[PDB]
Amino acid sequence: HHHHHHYFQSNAMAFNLRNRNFLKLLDFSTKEIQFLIDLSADLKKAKYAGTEQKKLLGKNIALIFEKASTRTRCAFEVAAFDQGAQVTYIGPSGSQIGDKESMKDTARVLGRMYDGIQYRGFGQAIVEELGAFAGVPVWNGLTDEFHPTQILADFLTMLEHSQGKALADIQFAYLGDARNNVGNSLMVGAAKMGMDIRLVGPQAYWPDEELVAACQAIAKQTGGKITLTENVAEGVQGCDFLYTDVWVSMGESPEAWDERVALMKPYQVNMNVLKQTGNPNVKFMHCLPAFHNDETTIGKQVADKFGMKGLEVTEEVFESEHSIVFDEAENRMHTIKAVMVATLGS
Amino acid sequence: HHHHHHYFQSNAMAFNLRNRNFLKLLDFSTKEIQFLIDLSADLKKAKYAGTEQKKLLGKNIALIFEKASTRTRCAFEVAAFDQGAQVTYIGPSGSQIGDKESMKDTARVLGRMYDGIQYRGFGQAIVEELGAFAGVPVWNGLTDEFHPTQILADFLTMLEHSQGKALADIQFAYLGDARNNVGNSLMVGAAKMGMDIRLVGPQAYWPDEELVAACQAIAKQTGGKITLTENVAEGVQGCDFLYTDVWVSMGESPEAWDERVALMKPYQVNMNVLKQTGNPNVKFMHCLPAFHNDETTIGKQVADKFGMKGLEVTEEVFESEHSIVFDEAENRMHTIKAVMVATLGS
Amino acid sequence: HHHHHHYFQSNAMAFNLRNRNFLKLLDFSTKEIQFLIDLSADLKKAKYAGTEQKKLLGKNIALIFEKASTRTRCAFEVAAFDQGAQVTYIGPSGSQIGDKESMKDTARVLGRMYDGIQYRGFGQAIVEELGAFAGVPVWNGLTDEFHPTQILADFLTMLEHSQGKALADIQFAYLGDARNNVGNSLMVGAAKMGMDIRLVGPQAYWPDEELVAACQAIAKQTGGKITLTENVAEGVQGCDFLYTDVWVSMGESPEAWDERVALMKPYQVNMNVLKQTGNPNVKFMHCLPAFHNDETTIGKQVADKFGMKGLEVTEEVFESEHSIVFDEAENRMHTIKAVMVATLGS
């Protein structure tokens, strides 16, 4: 009911992508990105039909998580397993890479043992170094400034939930705190693919100024469009998809929450916000986890203190027919599989 | 030297059990339980003969442990591996399911990625929710109120150590603190299979009153018998197996131990207690780990403070010829394999 | 460019080694050790040629790490995977084996489930007990007093970086704190294989006196030679390889560092020390991780406090053409594979 139905150019990309790292969307062309998205669709159809061909048979993959994330971890594990690879999960330890041993040294050892490496952690500088010295494909599971795999999942999902529209024809808005890896990659992604993106939220939390200038140079070339606005009505108008993510921070701070909630509350995605799009076929997306209700411990707590049931999105929207968050969530795997098969596939 | 040697009904169960969750013994019929126990015996013989057929080939299984347990973990891993499945071990993290994200959301994501899920954690309410929303078989590795896999292992072991007696013909006593998952499942198990169980220990630690009433309604139908008594002599008389489990608690409390030890000490299984059964072929069982001696750190500590070498069971009994705790321990795997193959086997 | 090129005796060892544990080099003959080293070379050539035959297909291996060590962990995982085995990684938990449950009990349970077990932890007494009661091959990933796998890797590397010299013809020096597992195994290894070893460092940190006497009894028989000296000039003279390892301790103590650095500094391996060998083909080895520079956090910290850029070895030596630390690091895997295939290989 909801899927993406797509010569010498099929394997021209196979060549370009073989042995490449996957550190950030900025490192790829629009065609290369489309290819990964198309490949994901095949791998997905193959798995469902029970006709998936293993292209990573015999390969060993190291999964470095300096900061735990079950959801991205599973995406890689299941993707690897389906393809015949074996996995070694290296989770958070007492020391972080750099504290007492450098990436340069770490990269060089893992590279001798494994065929591919996944890193999920801190600064992009770190993965970039791992990428430079490992000698095997390195893939960014998430850094402070970027989160590429997520966006592949997001665009595949958008294509699957459109009736024959290309990414170049889609319009979408991201509401909330865009000054982060998700916000950044969604903008680069939107730019690279010639989409119409709108970052709706407080000016202080729009993405990096330099990054926006860089992404707008790209947009101009791909026929895409980027608009940054604090005005919800104007921002969500006519969009095909609405997207948000938790904008509070577990930990700091008691009153920083009073403050934070006050600043971000106007941007929660609620039914009222979907109605402002003037598009009844509008779909809601969220990278997850979402604080969409009154049932978690931190949810009852937010309810008692701010009288709110859900922060960035309401339970009504989250469990609505417009919500496609779980298709989106599943797509992390098919897209991550695409990245591995394309770069390391034999 | 010690094993279980057992039409249209063979596959009538195959049907009933396909796609089922395995949350508690209360959810199954006596025939269904017997089937799982019989299947385990085949899988065990197959592995030993080097003729095991993989019925989970290609399947990916998620192992959720909110509270670590190497012994149940290994049982699942080795069972999965022997059957051609791949495994993702998700151990204890900073937050527990519910603190900041609900099972409803968690279940729905894992269900899209994995083919089967194992949960080991807190309240039964939690696994039940996972079972309702995952969309794939869910198996209870242990909750506060039940521990079904353990009992399958226990009954298989009983059958293996009997000379042609059916579970319906066995008599056994559980000494100690029965107000817990092990005590509960042993009672439901005993009831479902028409056995003669006797919970020997302080009235305050007999199982839940409602549960006992429920299990006695069952017993009456299966021709089983449940008796709860504080009298050891009367309780262990004529039993085929004696069973116990640690009844102290690592942590709370310094004097709660003085108190606890004083209350439970009369129920330790010692040679004197086996002799009270009037049955020289009596066998001792223990789900493990057992504080059976003077060698562990907490063992020397208990020795210096209460002058005891072993709490719930004595070293002499534990290393005696009556002890079958390690066959019992191995059987966790064969029985867990049975549960997975029966519910997810293709 | 750098590799080791080597009847009824080929399989006479196959017999001797089948089902053996690998707890310490003291438990093996010089021929047995050479065999493991030779086997490693084949397994290495096979993997590179893409013609490796799986001799552990279907086997399940438990990896016990009471004290984390990614580098030895990966070595085992990749070795197991390449050979068709499955792995269960049991990392550091709340309690250590012995605190509340004995090895005797633990060994007996794992032995029923797994086909082979790896232990990395505390005292040798512990692995020895695991080795006695598991009933399946047990392998020492590292204990307080020994670290055998590392030395196999080290000797293979030495053979690979020699132009047709046997271990019996090599000369090497270990500079620093030799009173530990690495120092111990290097000495036993050197003795067993008839090498010329020299432990260069403070007399207080020479290996155990009894162990040295034991190793010298061996050396005398194999035509090897062991010399312990505080004199660097005299110690490194004419060596083929120089070897060191971090001699500080993360944690204790602020001034114990002032003290420690002052005592060990004269033994850092710097270009000046390589030149003292009078051998321009000299190669540097280090088990890793090494504090060889000014870039890690603890590195900038050591730079600001003692004005040093690198402790046991200088960046210049570590990244020099003499450094073979990464070939050495890779060889942990090929040698560990050898140990498993030889003992459990079918």
PDB file of C-alpha atoms in Angstrom, chain A residues 26 145-146 174 177-180 182-192 195 197-222 224-229:
ATOM      1  CA  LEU A  26      27.824  16.848   2.273  1.00  0.00           C
ATOM      2  CA  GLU A 145      27.015  17.906  13.855  1.00  0.00           C
ATOM      3  CA  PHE A 146      25.535  15.233  11.539  1.00  0.00           C
ATOM      4  CA  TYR A 174      10.930  20.779  10.670  1.00  0.00           C
ATOM      5  CA  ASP A 177      15.350  23.020  17.723  1.00  0.00           C
ATOM      6  CA  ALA A 178      17.069  22.686  14.359  1.00  0.00           C
ATOM      7  CA  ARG A 179      20.588  23.513  15.652  1.00  0.00           C
ATOM      8  CA  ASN A 180      21.784  19.932  15.776  1.00  0.00           C
ATOM      9  CA  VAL A 182      19.179  16.003  12.731  1.00  0.00           C
ATOM     10  CA  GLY A 183      18.396  19.584  11.750  1.00  0.00           C
ATOM     11  CA  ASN A 184      21.705  19.902   9.926  1.00  0.00           C
ATOM     12  CA  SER A 185      21.426  16.689   7.886  1.00  0.00           C
ATOM     13  CA  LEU A 186      17.780  17.331   7.033  1.00  0.00           C
ATOM     14  CA  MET A 187      18.854  20.703   5.596  1.00  0.00           C
ATOM     15  CA  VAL A 188      21.862  19.331   3.673  1.00  0.00           C
ATOM     16  CA  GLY A 189      19.670  16.435   2.531  1.00  0.00           C
ATOM     17  CA  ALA A 190      16.879  18.777   1.433  1.00  0.00           C
ATOM     18  CA  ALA A 191      19.410  20.960  -0.381  1.00  0.00           C
ATOM     19  CA  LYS A 192      21.202  18.126  -2.159  1.00  0.00           C
ATOM     20  CA  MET A 195      13.512  19.869  -1.959  1.00  0.00           C
ATOM     21  CA  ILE A 197      12.589  22.694   3.424  1.00  0.00           C
ATOM     22  CA  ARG A 198      11.505  25.143   6.121  1.00  0.00           C
ATOM     23  CA  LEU A 199      13.053  25.211   9.568  1.00  0.00           C
ATOM     24  CA  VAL A 200      10.352  26.498  11.926  1.00  0.00           C
ATOM     25  CA  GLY A 201      11.459  27.598  15.381  1.00  0.00           C
ATOM     26  CA  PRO A 202      13.306  30.256  17.430  1.00  0.00           C
ATOM     27  CA  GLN A 203      15.983  32.088  15.440  1.00  0.00           C
ATOM     28  CA  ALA A 204      18.532  31.193  18.142  1.00  0.00           C
ATOM     29  CA  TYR A 205      18.070  27.524  17.282  1.00  0.00           C
ATOM     30  CA  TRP A 206      18.255  27.717  13.536  1.00  0.00           C
ATOM     31  CA  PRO A 207      21.183  25.744  12.168  1.00  0.00           C
ATOM     32  CA  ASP A 208      24.720  27.072  12.035  1.00  0.00           C
ATOM     33  CA  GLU A 209      24.925  30.257   9.984  1.00  0.00           C
ATOM     34  CA  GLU A 210      27.850  28.990   7.868  1.00  0.00           C
ATOM     35  CA  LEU A 211      26.095  25.696   7.229  1.00  0.00           C
ATOM     36  CA  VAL A 212      22.962  27.491   6.087  1.00  0.00           C
ATOM     37  CA  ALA A 213      25.000  29.607   3.670  1.00  0.00           C
ATOM     38  CA  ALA A 214      26.665  26.436   2.379  1.00  0.00           C
ATOM     39  CA  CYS A 215      23.326  24.652   1.966  1.00  0.00           C
ATOM     40  CA  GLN A 216      21.804  27.553   0.209  1.00  0.00           C
ATOM     41  CA  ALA A 217      24.623  27.622  -2.329  1.00  0.00           C
ATOM     42  CA  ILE A 218      23.720  23.957  -3.003  1.00  0.00           C
ATOM     43  CA  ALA A 219      19.947  24.567  -3.109  1.00  0.00           C
ATOM     44  CA  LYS A 220      20.373  27.279  -5.724  1.00  0.00           C
ATOM     45  CA  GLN A 221      22.068  24.670  -7.985  1.00  0.00           C
ATOM     46  CA  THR A 222      19.602  21.791  -7.419  1.00  0.00           C
ATOM     47  CA  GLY A 224      15.735  23.422  -4.000  1.00  0.00           C
ATOM     48  CA  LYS A 225      14.617  25.982  -1.441  1.00  0.00           C
ATOM     49  CA  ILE A 226      15.502  26.636   2.196  1.00  0.00           C
ATOM     50  CA  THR A 227      13.553  29.098   4.366  1.00  0.00           C
ATOM     51  CA  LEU A 228      14.170  29.736   8.054  1.00  0.00           C
ATOM     52  CA  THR A 229      11.275  31.279  10.006  1.00  0.00           C
TER      53      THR A 229
END
